[PDB]
Amino acid sequence: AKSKNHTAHNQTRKAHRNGIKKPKTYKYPSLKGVDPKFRRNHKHALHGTAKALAAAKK
Amino acid sequence: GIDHTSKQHKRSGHRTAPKSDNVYLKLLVKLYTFLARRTDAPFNKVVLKALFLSKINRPPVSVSRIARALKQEGAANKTVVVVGTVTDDARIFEFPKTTVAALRFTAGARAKIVKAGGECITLDQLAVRAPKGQNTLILRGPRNSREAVRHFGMGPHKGKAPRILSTGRKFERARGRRRSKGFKV
Amino acid sequence: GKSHGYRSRTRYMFQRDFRKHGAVHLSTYLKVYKVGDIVDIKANGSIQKGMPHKFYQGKTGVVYNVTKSSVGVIINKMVGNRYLEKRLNLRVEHIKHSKCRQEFLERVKANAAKRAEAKAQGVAVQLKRQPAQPRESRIVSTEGNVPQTLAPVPYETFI
Amino acid sequence: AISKNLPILKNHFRKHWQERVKVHFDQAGKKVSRRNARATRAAKIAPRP
Amino acid sequence: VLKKNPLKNKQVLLRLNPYAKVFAAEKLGSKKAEKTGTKPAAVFTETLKHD
Amino acid sequence: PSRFTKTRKHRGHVSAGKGRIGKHRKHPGGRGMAGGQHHHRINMDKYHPGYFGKVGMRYFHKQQAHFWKPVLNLDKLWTLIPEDKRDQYLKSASKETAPVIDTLAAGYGKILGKGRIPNVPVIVKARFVSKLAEEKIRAAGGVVELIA
Amino acid sequence: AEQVAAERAARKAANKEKRAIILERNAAYQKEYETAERNIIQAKRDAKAAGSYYVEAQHKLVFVVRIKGINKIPPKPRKVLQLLRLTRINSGTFVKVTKATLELLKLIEPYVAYGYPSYSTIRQLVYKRGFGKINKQRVPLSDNAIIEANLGKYGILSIDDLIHEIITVGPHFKQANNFLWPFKLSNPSGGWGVPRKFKHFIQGGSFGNREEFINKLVKSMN
RNA sequence: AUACUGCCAGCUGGGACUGAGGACUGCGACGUAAGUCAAGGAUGCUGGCAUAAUGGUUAUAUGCCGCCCGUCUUGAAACACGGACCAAGGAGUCUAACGUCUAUGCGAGUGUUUGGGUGUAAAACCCAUACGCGUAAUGAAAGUGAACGUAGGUUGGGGCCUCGCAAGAGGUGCACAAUCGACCGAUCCUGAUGUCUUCGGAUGGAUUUGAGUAAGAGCAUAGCUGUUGGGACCCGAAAGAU
RNA sequence: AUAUGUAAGAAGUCCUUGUUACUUAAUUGAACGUGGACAUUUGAAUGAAGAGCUUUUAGUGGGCCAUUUUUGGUAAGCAG
RNA sequence: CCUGAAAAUGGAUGGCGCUCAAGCGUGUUACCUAUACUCUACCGUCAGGGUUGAUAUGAUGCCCUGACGAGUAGGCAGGCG
């Protein structure tokens, strides 16, 4: 009793029912996977700039 | 025949006329439907929608949250509006002289506000007092802090609180959660 | 039975070029990439480390990370009924700057200059691009250009 | 079988639990009987606490 | 309640177009043109009749 | 409310909402947690990772009375005072007259420092205390003394 | 305050002023159409006299009607018809000819009949089957008040102002055309003139570009 | 001159279908005046009958259509299966433990009903020290255990506040989403004064990690739907045991 | 050829600057910014009978037939 | 067009029949009729709105609306017994 092996029939219709809208884009993307030496630097630099801005306009 | 771009006879997807059979809630909804229709203040429309909202979409607002909101600069003398229940919070020790209009007050929060010197107000008194929402500050409780929502979207590499009855060792702490037993999630 | 390897059915894709085999010229290494740069992916078959997959061959992405000898690229890949974000660590031999963004930046500068000239005078600079419009009226003369009558040619075997 | 995201429940009902079902219908009647027994023993030991 | 077609119902026509009255009055639907005989070039007719 | 069920609405429809092709059969996938490693492994791996295997070490005859130790935080520390005397204690923020909180009769075993008690001195009687909780009580001017 | 007739008379005065503006604008539009037609004619005659060939300006506007039904349409032509707002058979739309528009029409040619509409056919289309899209609702024009209310930001203050904006494709052609609801035409009253529609117009069918015969077809369907 | 095309906000007819709405409202037209009108939906006049005449039902005749339902199936009128007929009976139930949602009560608490009191003798009605869940997590475990700050910074945020005659500016910004941090636990480290000189583990960290903190949201009851164990929607083995 | 990745902006474009333990021979770079200049065209077309989804659950998981590209087979109302 | 051109019940351009066709190729045109299109009435669904008035109205009450309507498995809602 052999049966159908594979088909992509109806698959694009199914996808396009409520489908292929673009991924939601964000300001401030995640830094995960970014160089950790750079991330250490960025932590220190963001700390410094927040402190400078607080001092300038408390 | 028409090649429809959208689904036909599609309902609104939003609540109107809340599921509650509370006659007094229906009276408030009637008053604020009138106000939102005939006032063009956005506050009345927002309050009408919040009246339609359900219980999990109307989380309690603690008096500590109200105090934090009144700590906003220029917001000390604003009327704090909660479409829902104001609950007591013993983690604070002082409370200002504010006026808070809410659907329900717990006994503790009601007594806290009255003793602090302000007044607890019902939304219809608020409508009489400020028909266009003048000098109001709407607060909403934490909605995604429910226990139910912490299991939403559970999957591999999501970190979203499995649906489990017993918690501890030998309850989902094994193959699939640590590299010592196979893999990790 | 069936084979689906990492470099499956890439026989011609990673084939180097005709008379462009061997050591790669140094401009590809001298080119610098910053975060947010738009980069085209075209794998160098000669360099086998940090090689992109055959799916990302010919894809354009955005740089999100920069390392010693490579770069991180963000690619939106269609998986089923949505796009998933894919992060690649590709070498500069397979990476190349995309020129569409460069043309758009040049246009941005051109619009800035035209707007400055508009602030100077006010002559309806009309920044936005327009499609090819239908041709307007024109008059064609016949000085040394008398129409030459053509006719369908009779059939011939020619072989 | 096993299905969508749900807790793993352990309902120990694989024996003949329906023979050993004790639904306490006699709660009110037994409270009355206990009060009656207390009153009867009080009448029996009439001076005692 | 009931859509009345212009291009009939002169009332609705004049409601939607005050200029319809003057168009009809001056009969701009049949408006003559002044006649001036610019003779075409002989090369054009020779090309038109050319085999 | 048997009359509000979909069994009442399925009257007249052949399959009772169970399908004509894949019908309502007895146990088409197994009974209970059957095949959690074989054909329900996908569900087990998706929704209950860590289900199979053992990790920790056993504890024969474990009594939870040994481990009874409810935790009380500093923000809730002042609720152990009755509301009547709470205002007087808060206002008369003095040493040598500090209120006594006996968290053991309150029902707690350990005190944790979740933060921001007022600056009223207070004598706290606790079986166990955390470092931060003790430091915050000292800063408020009170003392935590150990009981049993 | 009674305001029982004072406000009415003031409204009548404002209406009279608006009618005066509409009358003057419509006379200007008629002069403009006549001048353009006459000038094209005279340019042709002048070129012929001078021994040249006056090439007419390529037509800037087309009218397109969906000729095929809503069954068995491939996804790309389906999407293009949806974007051109021809979601039903015998439904028509004005399109502003550009390169993008031309490549749009070329994709849906087997499913549409289009061509270059005239001032006459456009005015008849707007007057008879003229409905605006006001708050996502199809309301018949039937009055200049609503056209003014919905297109007055662009200076379109009357049905003939809208007609002129559609014909002499203007800066606000996009807004005016999108305000115009898709034209629901009937079947042609004298038939299609062909035994079979779904061949090209060149092949003796119906679909494709009937450059100027779209006027005859659409006036039959309208 | 006629063709042939195109336009007419050009004229003259012959037919058919429809007449929705129902207390002034609007836009217009008529020598630019009170008024009229074909202008936001039919009125005017006239006749016959007032009854089975119209119409309803019903049986038949005629014209054109119309294969036997249910089921499994890619496909059933099927030369596939069940069904001679009729009446009555006949098939997603209840329970234990739960998921989402919703309503309700109270709310950092919540649940009286195991019991006790009482009673108009299974109902009412009244009474907690307890216990369950929640209010703390994390680690296998010894154990340790949640503010460097206005409970943080940034982007976006409804609403509110200050606003000039219609822009739009500023301020404050709850919920919620993205991101960078801070705190608690685990892991890996560096280890201060001291010292039962081997202990305690301050301090500083780390592309690590947690179902956490970061002005609580839960508890209880009920309802639909879904889950699992139960005869488990109803009927159905060949078997196996005592 | 058809099909296919990306871009066509306000999260954008340009300036003694401010932060950092990263980077540089070097206030040179890198990242993130404070302060500034951009309006009635905010940077192609068309459309948008609302846009972002959140939870939860049914049935389904035998398919078959076109014009087209196509594999095995002499072929098949064959198999893929 | 004819030859090539042979299969079993009697027999099918659908049938009758048709020969300057009622056949074949082609070309205007008229005409016929779908549950399609246009326009009206009515039903329901969805949606966007109006509506606080001294009695004679339990405000999704009354009303203005515009669009739309196939359906197995299946879901949900309003109802009838």
Maximum CA extent, chain B: 69
Residue F118, CB, less than 7 Å from strand H?
Answer: no
Distance separating alpha carbons of residues G200 and G112, to the nearest angstrom:
10
Tell whether the torsion through CA atoms of B136, B141, B144 and B145 is positive or negative: positive
Resolution value (Å, 1 decimal)? 2.6
Q: How far is the CA of B183 from the C1' of H203 (A)?
A: 36
Q: Does E49 touch chain C (CB under 8 A)?
A: no
Residues 31-70 of B with CB under 7 A from strand H: 41-43, 46, 54-57, 59-62, 64-65, 67-69
- Contact: C82, A16; criterion CB under 8 Å: no
In Å, how far is G38's CA from the nearest CA of chain B?
43
Distance separating alpha carbons of residues G63 and G129, to the nearest angstrom:
14
Angle between helices G119-128 and G159-167 (to 10 degrees): 140
Using CA coordinates, name the residue in chain G closest to B4: G87
CA distances from residue E21 to B146, E11, G32, G159, G162 in whole angstroms, order as listed: 73, 10, 19, 16, 19
* Residues C79/C20, Cβ–Cβ less than 8 Å: no
SS3 C13: coil
* Beta strand F110-112 pairing with F128-129: parallel
Q: How far is the CA of B180 from the C1' of H52 (A)?
A: 98
CA distances from residue G24 to E18, G28, G127, G164 in whole angstroms, order as listed: 9, 6, 19, 14
* Beta strand C60-66 pairing with C38-41: antiparallel
| Residue F73, H or E segment | strand F71-73
- Chain G residues in contact with E39 by the CB 8 A cut-off are 49
Q: What CA dihedral angle connects G78, G83, G89 and G90, to 10 degrees? A: -150
* Residues C67/C34, Cβ–Cβ less than 8 Å: no
Burial-class residue B140 by CB neighbours within 10 Å (0-12, 13-18, 19+).
middle
- Contact: F55, B178; criterion CB under 8 Å: yes
Q: What is the DSSP letter of C70?
A: E
* Residues F136/F74, Cβ–Cβ less than 8 Å: yes
Distance separating alpha carbons of residues F111 and B52, to the nearest angstrom:
43
Q: What is the DSSP letter of G74?
A: -
Q: Does G53 touch chain C (CB under 8 A)?
A: yes
* Residues B151/D5, Cβ–Cβ less than 8 Å: yes
Tell whether the torsion through CA atoms of C36, C40, C46 and C51 is positive or negative: positive
SS3 B81: strand
Distance separating alpha carbons of residues C109 and C116, to the nearest angstrom:
11
| Continuous H helices in chain G | 6-50, 75-83, 99-108, 119-128, 144-151, 159-167, 173-179, 214-221
Q: What CA dihedral angle connects G16, G17, G22 and G27, to 10 degrees? A: 100
* Number of C-beta neighbours around residue G63 at 10 A: 23
Nearest alpha-carbon partner for G62 in G110, G19, G112: G112
Q: How far is the CA of B3 from the C1' of H71 (A)?
A: 35
Of G47, G53, G98, the CB nearest to C131: G98
Experimental method: cryo-EM
Tokens coding G184 = 């629901």
Distance separating alpha carbons of residues F3 and F1, to the nearest angstrom:
5
Distance separating alpha carbons of residues G28 and G16, to the nearest angstrom:
18
Q: How far is the CA of G37 from the C1' of H11 (A)?
A: 27
The chains in contact with chain F, meaning 3 or more Cβ pairs closer than 8 Å, are: B, D
- Chain A residues in contact with C81 by the CB 8 A cut-off are 14-20
Tokens coding F26 = 């007895």
SS3 C35: coil
- Chain D residues in contact with F32 by the CB 8 A cut-off are 1
Work out the end-to-end distance of chain C between its first and last CA atoms, rounded to an integer number of angstroms.
Answer: 50
Distance separating alpha carbons of residues G205 and G193, to the nearest angstrom:
9
Nearest nucleotide to B8, CA against C1' atoms? J68
Q: What is the CA radius of gyration of chain B?
A: 22
| Residue F105, H or E segment | helix F103-106
Tokens coding G98 = 């550009």
Q: How many residues does chain B have?
A: 185
Tokens coding G134 = 């006001």
